[PDB]
Amino acid sequence: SQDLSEALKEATKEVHIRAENSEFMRNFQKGQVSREGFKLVMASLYHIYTALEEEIERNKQNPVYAPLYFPEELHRRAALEQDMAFWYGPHWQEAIPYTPATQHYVKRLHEVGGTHPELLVAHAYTRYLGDLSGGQVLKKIAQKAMALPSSGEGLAFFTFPSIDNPTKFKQLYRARMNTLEMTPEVKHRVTEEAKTAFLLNIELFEELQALLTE
């Protein structure tokens, strides 16, 4: 569409359906993910968010991103570290895996953050909006399936204490996106990078799904 928010939604409509229909997400949605499979994805998201947020800090003041700087409400690294401590123990740092797909995803994040900051928004959009949408639905499935403490330990990643109304917040995040100044050509590259983002996620779920059945 015209506004970035709508252009992104329109451009990723297909890959999104493909992402939720991946073998791994379907099993997860039916409550058939194992503790080992869950530990794997969370370990992968750790590296992913560590890189993403690393690049966000680098570009937090660049106008091509700045309007979307939400460290207190969205950043996931700290939450993910609490989850690693929970699922892997005090030495999770040297214990967590780092799959090829994960490095490949991380690799793209650092290129974007380093040489194409004007595209970072596509990666933030893909991850954070999903976390406040389907991530919230998956959080409840994980709760019944894994049987974790009602205290929230092990699922800090799915919890956003500063966002009491995710629907409202997503609206504000979209409004901020439509505030970004960029030529029509950069906007197209941004929607395209968003596709890649989903793809990176899709191929990750394919890799992880293959590691489990293995």
Ligand code: HEM
């Ligand atoms: C587990 C399966 C999933 C389900 C059931 C699901 C469900 C949804 C729903 C219902 C919305 C619309 C919320 C709204 O209108 O504000 C949404 C939006 C979104 N989802 Fe998913 N999702 C899933 C997986 C994913 C994955 C794996 C990603 C990314 C890697 C993702 C990324 C997004 C994004 C970026 C949006 C925002 C779209 C926009 O408003 O422009 N989702 N999702």
